[PDB]
Design a protein around this nucleic acid. Structure first.
Ligand SMILES: [Mn+2]
Ligand SMILES: [Mn+2]
Ligand SMILES: [Mn+2]
Ligand SMILES: [Mn+2]
Ligand SMILES: [N+]
Ligand SMILES: [N+]
Ligand SMILES: [Zn+2]
Ligand SMILES: [Zn+2]
Lengths: 180, 368, 368, 180
DNA sequence: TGCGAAATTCCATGACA
DNA sequence: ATTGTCATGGAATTTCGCA
DNA sequence: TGCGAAATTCCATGACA
DNA sequence: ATTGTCATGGAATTTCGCA
């Protein structure tokens, strides 16, 4: 079997609804399977068309062989089916209700919360740094960060402090204050 | 004055006036029998005013000035006085063209790594498409990999919006651009400092200096053109297609697409290259580092037979940028402070400000 | 189709496919083991669609197209099919640039006599002076002797007004101009016929063709500039001064002023040449006829190493004159009817009209 | 003595008042002495300033060493004096009430009358042809026309028919009809 | 160890400003 | 304080396929 | 039948469009 | 049915002034 390469598989999924930030409510998460490289797109809905609009930007840079998703409404529509067929992208679905990728999805949910607290509205602007972080974070499995695996080079923004990622006491209580 | 001319009339020898000729008085003036005819020798005290009147008729150069003077006068070393005047006529110095070419172009080293250097620039205005009139073109120095963003204006704010989206992928060491309003504003400067991005600038009015991106604009426009043949010019929806098309196109001289220089593997696009199928990613990245170092690099071309290179302390003149109708195309002379390289200098513009300037926007002031 | 590929699979030899390689079936397609890797050999019935899809990605030339195809396929004489396609892509043919230079310029004989040929042209608009915005420049071919008339517009009527004043001195055989509205109008045509003046026209959009006058415009503007330094641009009152100044200025290469070529004697202007003082007028005119015949004439320069000359029946394309934004810079191919000279042709513009056209506004359609 | 050249002397004088033609009433006549070449300028008055305006056009083409005129008001003013001094032109006056040149002045007066008759208003437009005629008319003294003497060449408009110049019976009576 | 043709490389030309 | 670039398609040169 | 300097000629460069 | 041109000022070359 041929070894795994970048662009072999993109894993997509939505996160949200979030607090409104500059008119946006969700995040479309795209993680490359081989490299663990993450792309994020703000959307107003988890709809086929918010997906197609966003993937259109990404698929202007790189086209995956396969997209993998849950059986979310957005991804099982025949519009989205058409959209992929048009690009020779093959669709792949995890069965309803059922590695490297799943950790990344967890990291994103957690790293977001760590910063939305105190400013649940400013997340739009933070999406760029959130990504650089995610993509310049060392993998303990592979010796390399996804940036290095993607481009074959060190980055000019190394995140030398693999960070707390953890909610402190000031936050735990002001995140339990926001919820009330 | 009469000083030198007197001894001459008697027939005793003066340096400069050949002794084999015959000098006499007639009608009140000193004359001489020269092969071409009889000419008035004016007193040295008169010679400047003469050269001046002759040159001033049509503000003529050396020979065309000389030929007027030689109609009535002869004196020793006429052109020396003619040239002294030319080098002092403010009006000729700032209006005449140069007749000396720039020295041969430098070919800067290719950035070593992706994201070492971005070249950026705006294209437009273009026919309005969905209310958009410009395109922001970002070109990675090393790979040629290019991003396009439709804008409403070539504004700082539209630049920042687009680059925040782009830098979400990586942050570059340097961004190079021209001295456009959008890039020189302090708002942009702060956006750069905020990210440890160094802003690099092309000397003024010298687009060769952003050659990388200017050149890529050509392809962008050329392919947009082809694609819009016999259709109305709706280019907004085509930017994404053109981006992809170009990033995945072979440079015949490199034998690589910019995409391959960026990632070391083609993505799921037509005619994707399959040669590294069997190597592990790491074997791939290792072969990519080797491909990147051994790319073709042009060499500086031969100087043209009449070029000039800048010398510290030389008198030179900067080209007037947007010269009004019937106004001089050159600024007053200024002095070369420092030679940054054979094609770039710092001049004291005798106001005087320090200016860094391309030699393509310079002529060497004539007649010392 | 499967025709040729079948015998190949068995191992019996077909022309074009080298016998030393091994051709097999796998995954449903005919493949081959080539040094660079394993490539699909498509059936001839498929090859066109392939070349097409590859070329269409970014509308690329020969090599950059070939390199995409060579990623998946191999077949005999690939470039031959690639080139067949390129020569048929309307969109590349009308949008791409040429990479072949025009043949070397002709240097037409100098008119033999004053008034044999006038070159005329307009300069402007200029900053309004006394309500005037243009200058009509008339340049006698043989002498360079030049007349200037301030106008409000580059109109037929202002042209006729000025030339009636000028022709009061003499009537020229020929008047040459560009295809400007003012000169091509039938009102002007009739004004010319009325006087036995032949109207000669520059091929379209080729000002080199009025080189004589274009070149004189340069001096006119250059001297106006010098004269208006640090003053407001009141050029109306200076036309007469510039006319005189220029007509009485030496051409260093000829060693004569246009005035002298016109009259054989300087008039009462500064630095008037006195060498023919003692000859009778007739002796003067006789020496002037001799001066006129022995003037310097440049010779056609060496061809550049990659130029083209036009051949009858060649497929060529005229340059689009004022091409809109993101539209082709070239017209569809057309055919060379007649070679008027190595730098001028008559083409059937496949509408089809006869057009006389400069090769500078032509490229030779690529790929036969 | 040095032989006579063109530009050695210009002979000027006014003709008129004429019938109004496009706002003009006079002709300033300039005849080069050596060549017999004639230049004509329409003016609204025989004034120093109509003279200076006109000679300015001519002296843009060629400057004479000497101007010769009668003691007309226009030519004896100190303005006109100044004007010439400025150009190194020397002024020369025939004494009050007192060759090649005088014949030309006669020709002009006569050739004008020959054509103003029937159309005393259209003379402005005719000034160009009047000149070509005058300047392409053979001198019986010299073998040459003033065009030939001026430029050293044949002209593209030879006036091969040295013409009547004379008033016929239809004209004599319609010129005596105009006068009444 | 050499031939004809095909594949590749060279590179001048022009267009981005 | 900075610096020209590269698709293009005929031609020139090298390589291939075969003895 | 030759030297140093001056005069002349050459000519690439750029700007008119 | 038409077609490049020429001022310019350093350099290259020729000529001059003198033996
Ligand atoms: Mn989901
Ligand atoms: Mn009188
Ligand atoms: Mn640009
Ligand atoms: Mn013009
Ligand atoms: N460099
Ligand atoms: N010719
Ligand atoms: Zn000057
Ligand atoms: Zn095409």
């Amino acid at each position: 079997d041929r070894p795994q390469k970048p662009f072999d598989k993109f894993f997509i999924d939505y996160i949200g609804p979030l607090p409104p930030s500059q008119g946006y409510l969700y995040v479309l998460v795209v993680v490359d399977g081989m490299t663990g490289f993450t792309w994020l797109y703000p959307t107003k809905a988890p709809s086929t068309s918010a997906t197609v609009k966003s993937l259109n930007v990404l698929t202007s840079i790189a086209i995956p062989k396969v997209i993998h998703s849950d059986q979310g409404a957005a991804f099982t529509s025949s519009t989205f089916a058409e959209w992929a067929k048009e690009r020779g992208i093959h669709l792949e679905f995890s069965t309803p209700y059922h590695g490297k990728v799943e950790r990344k999805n967890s990291d994103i949910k957690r790293l977001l919360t760590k910063l939305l607290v105190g400013r649940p509205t400013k997340w739009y602007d933070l999406l760029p740094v959130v990504q650089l972080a995610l993509n310049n974070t060392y993998s303990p499995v592979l010796k390399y960060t996804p940036h290095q695996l993607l481009f074959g080079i060190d980055s000019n923004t190394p995140f030398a402090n693999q960070d707390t990622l953890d909610l402190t006491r000031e936050e735990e209580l002001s995140l339990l204050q926001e919820i009330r | 004055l009469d000083a030198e001319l007197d001894q001459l009339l008697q027939g005793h020898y003066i340096k400069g006036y050949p002794k084999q000729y015959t000098y006499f008085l007639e009608d009140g003036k000193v004359k001489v029998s020269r092969p071409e005819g009889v000419k008035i020798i004016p007193p040295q005290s008169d010679r400047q005013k003469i050269v001046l009147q002759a040159h001033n008729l049509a503000h003529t150069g050396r020979e065309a000035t000389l030929l007027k003077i030689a109609n009535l006068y002869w004196w020793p070393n006429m052109r020396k006085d003619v040239v002294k005047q030319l080098g002092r006529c403010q009006q000729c110095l700032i209006t005449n063209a140069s007749n000396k070419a720039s020295g041969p172009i430098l070919r800067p080293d290719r950035p070593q790594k992706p994201f070492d250097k971005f070249f950026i620039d705006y294209i437009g205005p273009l026919p309005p498409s969905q209310g958009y009139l410009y395109v922001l073109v970002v070109v990675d120095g090393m790979t040629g990999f290019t991003w396009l963003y439709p804008t409403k204006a070539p504004s700082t704010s539209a630049t920042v919006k687009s680059l925040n989206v782009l830098t979400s992928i990586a942050i570059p060491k340097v961004i190079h651009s021209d001295q456009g309003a959008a890039f020189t504003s302090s708002t942009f400067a702060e956006w750069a400092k905020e990210r440890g991005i160094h802003l690099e600038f092309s000397t003024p009015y010298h687009p060769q200096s952003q050659g990388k991106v200017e050149r890529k604009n050509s392809d962008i426009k050329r392919l947009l053109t082809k694609l819009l043949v016999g259709r109305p010019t709706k280019w907004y929806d085509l930017l994404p297609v053109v981006q992809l098309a170009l990033n995945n196109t072979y440079s015949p001289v490199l034998k690589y697409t910019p995409h391959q220089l960026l990632f070391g593997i083609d993505s799921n696009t037509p005619f994707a290259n399959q040669d590294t199928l069997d190597l592990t990613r790491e074997e791939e990245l290792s072969l990519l580092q080797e491909i990147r170092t051994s790319l073709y690099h042009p060499s500086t071309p031969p100087a043209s037979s009449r070029s000039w290179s800048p010398v510290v302390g030389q008198l030179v003149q900067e080209r007037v940028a947007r010269p009004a109708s019937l106004r001089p195309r050159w600024h007053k002379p200024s002095t070369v402070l420092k030679v940054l390289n054979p094609r770039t200098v710092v001049i004291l513009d005798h106001l005087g400000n320090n200016r860094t300037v391309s030699i393509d926007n310079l002529k060497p002031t004539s007649h010392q």
